[PDB]
């Protein structure tokens, strides 16, 4: 059984840290694909949950986190993000 | 074969439809007897 209310498992990533991380990744990607190139991040597409979600073992449980809140943005030349 | 119903059908959260209360006839220590078992399974682990 489950004691108490039924709640969904989730992961929190802060917005400021993730946004800085992506800014650095884009800065480095522009060194291979050139500058004045737009770098767009997007969610994964098809396939099994093993590849469409972020799979990991958390304390013995197997989590499959959506991540589509982490990878959506277009880069042109405390406020957490909760992932179901 | 499992006989399942919705564990908490009145939720409005993202878990509506997830966590089913499934009953089944499980084996036991002796080969002559059966045990009725109720357990909760996630939707992703159970196929209709």
């Amino acid at each position, epitope marked *: 059984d489950i004691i108490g*209310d039924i*709640r*969904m498992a*989730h992961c929190n990533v802060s917005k400021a840290t993730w946004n800085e991380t992506l800014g650095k990744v884009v800065k480095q990607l522009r060194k291979h694909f050139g500058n004045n190139t737009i770098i767009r991040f997007a969610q994964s597409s098809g396939g099994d949950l093993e590849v469409t979600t972020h799979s990991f073992n958390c304390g013995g449980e197997f989590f499959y986190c959506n991540t589509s809140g982490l990878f959506n943005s277009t880069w042109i030349s405390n406020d957490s993000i*909760t992932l*179901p | 074969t499992l006989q399942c119903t919705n564990y908490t*059908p*009145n939720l*409005t*959260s*993202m878990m509506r439809g997830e966590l089913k209360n499934c009953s089944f006839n499980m084996t036991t220590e002796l080969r002559d007897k059966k045990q009725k078992v109720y357990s909760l399974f996630y939707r992703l682990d159970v196929v209709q």
Partner: antibody
Amino acid sequence: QVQLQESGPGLVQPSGTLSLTCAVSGDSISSNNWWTWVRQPPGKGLEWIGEIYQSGITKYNPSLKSRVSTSVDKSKNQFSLRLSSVTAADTAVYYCARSAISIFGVVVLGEYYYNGMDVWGQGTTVTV
Amino acid sequence: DIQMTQSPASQSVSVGETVTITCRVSENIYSHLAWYQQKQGKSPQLLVYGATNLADGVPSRFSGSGSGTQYSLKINNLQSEDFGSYYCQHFWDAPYTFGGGTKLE
């Protein structure tokens, strides 16, 4: 003791946009409530327009497809609707209300339930 | 979308009688329903939240009941101040549609 009051001047011309602002006084807009708008045409039943939370999360009635947007302003304790492309069927009394919820988990995951639209405002008549 | 039906369309009753207003829903909404009273031009006020919990400040003569796909509001010892329109709203799924409404006179 929330005392809501709508403004939102009417006499909007066809193909224009409405701007209806509901003031909140007696509380903040950071409480465990959704700020909601409804519509009641002159002689028809009561329609739901939409809801906005304190974080900017919104819900809209699909019938107002790409016609309605909602916003909040925490520095004013105000929230408002911007309903575009009015024709003639939008003449109605518009109301704002505080839709109370009980929160047990994370709001962005839908871990809450509604306790009814308490503390309705007085309403603003909007004609087109 | 869920369809909310309210019936009888109207009632004509005397003071002191008990009346029932019934809301029928196309889907089981697990008592996520609310009962509002619109006092003849005034903003609607909340009578019942949760289908069977009396709203704070509402007279005890208003009592909700129901389950599944059928919900009703019973008004005992109906007074003159209770005449007006009554509305039911499903909180189960969005858009939180409002039942057509009934007129109690």
